[PDB]
Scaffold this motif. Structure first.
Motif, short mmCIF file in Angstrom:
data_model
loop_
_atom_site.label_atom_id
_atom_site.label_comp_id
_atom_site.label_asym_id
_atom_site.label_seq_id
_atom_site.Cartn_x
_atom_site.Cartn_y
_atom_site.Cartn_z
N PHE A 283 47.08 43.47 37.20
CA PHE A 283 47.40 42.60 38.10
C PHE A 283 48.60 42.22 38.56
O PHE A 283 49.36 41.77 38.78
N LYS A 284 49.78 43.20 38.30
CA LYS A 284 51.15 43.49 38.53
C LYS A 284 51.04 44.18 40.26
O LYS A 284 51.29 43.58 41.19
N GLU B 196 45.18 47.38 33.17
CA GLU B 196 44.27 46.10 34.01
C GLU B 196 46.03 44.64 34.43
O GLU B 196 46.56 44.26 35.19
N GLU B 197 46.84 44.95 32.77
CA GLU B 197 48.38 44.81 34.07
C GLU B 197 48.94 45.44 34.69
O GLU B 197 49.31 45.04 35.37
N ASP C 128 58.87 45.30 31.49
CA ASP C 128 59.74 43.64 31.42
C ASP C 128 60.25 43.47 30.16
O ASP C 128 60.92 42.58 30.28
N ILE D 234 38.17 39.19 33.14
CA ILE D 234 39.04 39.80 32.14
C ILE D 234 38.54 38.72 30.55
O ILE D 234 38.42 38.91 29.52
N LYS D 235 39.26 37.51 30.74
CA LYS D 235 38.74 36.38 29.96
C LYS D 235 37.18 36.30 29.13
O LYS D 235 37.08 36.15 28.38
N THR E 259 41.71 37.66 36.66
CA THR E 259 42.27 37.04 35.11
C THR E 259 40.70 36.30 34.55
O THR E 259 41.19 36.00 33.78
C1 4QM Z 1 57.19 38.27 33.31
C2 4QM Z 1 55.28 38.85 33.68
C3 4QM Z 1 54.43 38.87 32.43
C4 4QM Z 1 53.22 39.59 33.31
C5 4QM Z 1 53.45 40.97 33.28
C6 4QM Z 1 52.46 38.99 31.56
C7 4QM Z 1 52.16 37.45 31.44
C8 4QM Z 1 50.69 36.63 31.98
C9 4QM Z 1 50.16 38.16 31.44
C10 4QM Z 1 48.63 38.04 32.13
C11 4QM Z 1 48.03 37.06 31.27
O1 4QM Z 1 47.87 36.92 29.57
C12 4QM Z 1 46.49 36.82 31.08
C13 4QM Z 1 45.77 37.92 31.22
C14 4QM Z 1 45.79 38.85 29.68
C15 4QM Z 1 44.89 40.20 29.11
O2 4QM Z 1 45.22 40.43 28.09
C16 4QM Z 1 45.55 41.53 29.60
C17 4QM Z 1 45.52 40.90 31.18
C18 4QM Z 1 46.29 39.53 31.47
C19 4QM Z 1 45.42 39.37 32.80
C20 4QM Z 1 48.39 39.42 31.74
C21 4QM Z 1 48.40 40.68 32.02
C22 4QM Z 1 49.88 40.72 32.07
O3 4QM Z 1 50.08 40.96 30.45
C23 4QM Z 1 51.06 39.17 32.29
C24 4QM Z 1 50.20 38.69 33.74
#
Ligand code: 4QM
Ligand code: ZN
Lengths: 69, 146, 135, 334, 102, 146
Positions: free
Chosen positions: D314-315, D310-311, D110, E99-100, E96
């Protein structure tokens, strides 16, 4: 000629396990089937990557043209 | 290629189903192949690049679930909708035909779906193999359509 | 009426040969000497055991775009009080002997041979029909 | 039923049957409230390079879409172009460039921007869309090596060029943007090359970000796959010595014999890799049946080291949602 | 500004009243076609939803939707896309929050 | 050639003609009517094939089938004969059924001047519907087959 960086099938990095595999075979005198498992190569596609590897780079380097042999 | 589907040596088809197309057609037209509407529709879209219009026939099984037999899939393969003009009727024996229990019974009442009967465009019996979809036989589906 | 045929049969043989989901059953009618049935049944949806009595009826309609649309849930139908409903086409009427004919139905590749006196098989008319089976 | 039955010669009931038109009841319409109530996530392990988690009450299509997007649609940073200055090794330049392109880089995707392809090479690479990695290794004879030694690590100085030799060269504002997160390879011990005295390697690698569909070096996951939850049903009790034999048809932690009744019971079906060995023996026929829960997926996402699994998951979910949104917002041309 | 070349309605395959239609979508493959197929088949008005990749060399996807007379195929496609968005949102929220939780 | 050393397959053609001209509201034909329709269609075709001797004049009826009067059209004539025979076989089958159900089998025409639908003493709900179920050859079916 040299150990590949990644496993062909999945994509796990096995290029950093060659020296450790040689050390576990030579120093620790472990068998070949346990040194692979100790390095985290669980899937057989990764095990065949360095179990069947032939390190021809050592043989090729004996004929160095930049330095008397 | 369209004008030369039959060899001039004997008149039999020479351009027909080869290996890995006969096997898949046999597995679709197997007697224990039952598909729900989702799998039926995906199969119908899989043979036409998602372009041809299909008229879904009523299912062969109705009370427990709604299940379409693979012979209905090939009936739709021969004739997709009402606008298609292909209406072919034929009776043929498969490669491996096991005769029925009694000599008085007709050929379609045999074991292992030996006899294929197509009336209208519905495949009422039998499986699709090299005898019905492959080359060398004059009772094949593609020969009749041609 | 809508019901072309109705009888109760006693099963004598279940032949699951070379198949895992479809079995070919043989049945003889109760209180009808000359009526005999040979039917392919999906055994997983409707399990059939030997020497079991089951009621078989043939109807022309279950009522009491051109793709097939299922009836709405809650609508009253002839299929409500049955365990196994099939849809097929009659394609062959043949004669076994005098006062005895056989009718062949194909429910999308699953066959049914119904043999009997042609007094009882008078209503079958070589068209699409529903086969309803219960226990 | 939603249990994929496992037999000795075939696999049955592999297709999803939750849609109206499957039966006369016409149930299982899409209700977002019912799916919100039924869906469940259970994380069992969460490391910095591997996550294991169960997705429960979700369809096969969505889980497979997540897996495919994780493998080949989540972008990652890898070396793309290699400029060579005096590669005098036995290893060819193509092979060395390919190996350097295959190393994983610990770079947050990113923090970069997609490279515009139609722009010319004089202005294609900027400080916002290119990471420069310089490698410079020269091998010389060791003047004070042991006489009886034969290890190249002692006879020579730099006979092993590793991936940690890929130094990061900040360009422009990357001197400040990448200040707290310097670019290092995710696996520093990757053996890139072997040298002998008189040979030298020096090169500059321009690294951009791409997707795994274009090339396998851009896939952020070493592996990313699911498996259905196994299910073992013991229809009749198995007693005595046969139970011990019944124990040997499974991995050691799967089933156990109770000490009281001396009968076998399933202890942990998750450990059961489905080898269906028990179906070979006639004594266990009509006594045990095997299956897999069709809507119970056990994802195991292993990262390549660039970013957390996990990232990555989520992505992948965000990419699928953005695909759906982009298709919804487009106009339909006749 | 809108992407006119993304999704097209193949005129030669649709019906006159719009009940049946086939849409050509560029730069997609099975990972979206299968999800759309599953979501659209959960529409009570849809009796036919099926996708296909006509050739691997072409990055293209043809999806056919035939409904009954209650709604057109375009409405079914839009509903399926919105419903897939909602499914992804629900999965995102559950993941999400778990995770928390740990 | 679509048959086993024959120009046309009679069984498949008959089944095709029966299926694509099927109609439950079409009254069946008596066997003599089927034979008459076949003769009406096939008469002018085999009548224009006049047999000439080697000299070049007409051949007497007493010696039409002799060896020295074999022409190039005989194969055509043979085909027509086989065609008629096949149709006759079907009619014969129907006649046999009418002889097995107590009815009158009209394989030959009853009389030159006799008119009316002569099945009238047999009960309609029992034996007429049964023979209509077992065999129903319509004029459209036989004309389409020819
Ligand atoms: C521009 C895109 C931003 C995106 C890739 C960033 C911005 C918001 C971020 C999530 C949130 O922080 C909530 C969580 C925190 C945990 O620690 C790790 C997982 C978690 C799902 C995150 C993953 C990731 O880091 C995200 C989606
Ligand atoms: Zn591997």
């Amino acid at each position: 000629m040299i150990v590949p960086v990644r496993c062909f099938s999945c994509g796990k990095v096995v290029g950093d396990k060659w020296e450790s595999y040689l050390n576990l075979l030579q120093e620790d005198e472990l068998d070949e089937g346990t040194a692979l498992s100790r390095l985290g190569l669980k899937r057989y596609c990764c095990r065949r990557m360095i179990l069947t590897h032939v390190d021809l780079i050592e043989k090729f380097l004996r004929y160095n043209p930049l330095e008397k042999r | 290629v369209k004008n030369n589907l039959l060899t001039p040596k004997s008149g039999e088809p020479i351009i027909a189903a080869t290996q890995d197309f006969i096997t898949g057609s046999y597995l679709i037209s197997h007697k224990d192949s039952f598909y729900d509407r989702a799998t039926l529709t995906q199969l119908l879209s899989m043979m036409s690049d998602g372009i041809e219009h299909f008229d879904i026939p009523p299912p062969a099984i109705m009370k427990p679930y709604y299940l379409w037999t693979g012979k209905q899939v090939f009936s739709l393969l021969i004739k997709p909708n009402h606008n298609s003009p292909v209406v072919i009727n034929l009776d043929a024996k498969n490669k491996v035909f096991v005769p029925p229990k009694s000599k008085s019974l007709p050929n379609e009442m045999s074991q292992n779906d030996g006899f294929v009967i197509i009336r209208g465009s519905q495949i009422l019996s039998g499986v699709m193999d090299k005898s019905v979809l492959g080359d060398g036989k004059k009772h094949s589906v593609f020969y009749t359509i041609l | 009426s809508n019901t072309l045929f109705d009888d109760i049969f006693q099963v004598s043989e279940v032949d699951p040969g070379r198949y895992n989901k479809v079995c070919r059953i043989e049945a003889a009618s109760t209180t009808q000497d000359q009526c005999k049935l040979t039917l392919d049944i999906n055994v997983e949806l409707f399990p059939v055991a030997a020497q079991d009595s089951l009621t078989v009826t043939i109807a022309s309609s279950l009522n009491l775009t051109r793709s097939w649309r299922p009836p709405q849930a809650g609508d009253r139908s002839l299929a409500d009080d049955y365990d196994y409903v099939m849809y097929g086409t009659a394609y062959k009427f043949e004669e076994v002997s005098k006062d005895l004919i056989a009718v062949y139905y194909s429910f999308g590749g699953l066959l049914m041979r119904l043999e009997g006196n042609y007094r009882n098989l008078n209503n079958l008319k070589q068209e699409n029909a529903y086969l309803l089976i219960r226990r | 039923s939603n249990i994929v039955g496992i037999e000795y010669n075939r696999v049955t009931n592999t297709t999803s049957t939750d849609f109206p038109g499957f039966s006369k009841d016409a149930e299982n319409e899409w209700n977002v409230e019912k799916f919100k109530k039924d869906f469940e996530v259970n994380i069992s392990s969460l490391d910095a390079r591997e996550a294991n988690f169960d997705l429960i009450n979700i369809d096969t299509s969505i889980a497979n879409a997540f897996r495919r997007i994780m493998i080949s649609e989540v972008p990652s940073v890898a070396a793309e172009y290699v400029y060579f200055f005096n590669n005098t090794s036995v290893i060819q330049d193509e092979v060395l460039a390919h190996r350097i392109g295959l190393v994983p880089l610990k770079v947050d995707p990113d923090m970069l921007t997609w490279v515009d392809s139609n722009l010319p090479d004089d202005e294609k690479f900027t400080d916002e869309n290119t990471i420069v990695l310089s490698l410079n290794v020269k091998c010389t004879r060791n003047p004070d090596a042991p006489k009886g030694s034969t290890d190249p690590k002692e006879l020579y100085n730099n006979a092993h060029v590793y991936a940690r030799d890929l130094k990061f060269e900040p360009q422009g504002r990357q001197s400040t943007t990448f200040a707290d997160c310097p670019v290092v390879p995710a696996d520093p011990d990757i053996l890139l090359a072997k040298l002998r005295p008189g040979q030298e390697i020096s090169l500059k690698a321009h690294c951009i970000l791409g997707i795994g569909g274009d090339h396998a070096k851009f896939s952020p996951v070493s592996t990313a796959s699911y498996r259905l939850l196994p299910q073992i049903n013991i229809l009749q009790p198995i007693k005595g010595e046969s139970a011990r034999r019944f124990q040997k048809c499974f991995p050691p932690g799967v089933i156990g014999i109770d000490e009281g009744s001396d009968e076998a019971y399933v202890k942990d079906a998750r450990k059961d890799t489905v080898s269906r060995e028990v179906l070979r023996y006639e004594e266990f026929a009509d006594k045990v049946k095997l299956g897999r829960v069709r809507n119970h997926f056990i994802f195991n996402v292993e990262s390549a080291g660039a970013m957390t699994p996990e990232e990555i998951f989520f992505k992948s979910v965000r990419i699928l949602k953005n695909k759906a949104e982009y298709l919804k917002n487009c106009p339909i041309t006749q | 500004e809108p992407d006119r070349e993304k999704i097209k309605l193949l005129t030669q395959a649709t019906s006159e009243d719009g009940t049946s239609a086939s849409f050509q979508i560029v730069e997609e493959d099975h990972t979206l076609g299968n999800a759309l197929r599953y979501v659209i088949m959960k529409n009570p008005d849809v009796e036919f939803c099926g996708y296909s990749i006509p050739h691997p060399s072409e990055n293209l996807l043809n999806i056919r939707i035939q409904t009954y007379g209650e709604t057109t195929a375009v409405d079914a496609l839009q509903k399926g896309l919105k419903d897939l968005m909602d499914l992804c949102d629900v999965v995102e929220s559950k993941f999400t929050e778990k995770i928390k939780s740990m | 050639m679509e048959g086993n050393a024959q120009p046309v397959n009679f069984n498949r053609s008959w089944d095709h003609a029966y299926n694509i001209t099927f109609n439950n509201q079409d009254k069946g034909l008596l066997p003599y009517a089927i034979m008459e329709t076949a003769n009406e269609i096939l008469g002018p075709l085999e009548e224009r094939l006049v047999r000439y001797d080697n000299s070049g004049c007409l051949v007497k009826r007493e010696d039409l089938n002799k060896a020295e009067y074999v022409d190039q059209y005989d194969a055509e004539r043979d085909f027509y004969h086989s065609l008629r025979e096949y149709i006759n076989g079907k009619a014969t089958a129907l006649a046999n059924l009418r002889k097995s159900r107590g009815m009158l089998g009209l394989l030959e025409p009853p009389a030159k001047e006799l008119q009316g639908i002569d099945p009238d003493e047999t009960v309609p709900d029992n034996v007429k519907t049964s023979v209509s179920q077992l065999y129903r050859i319509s004029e459209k079916s036989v004309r389409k087959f020819l």
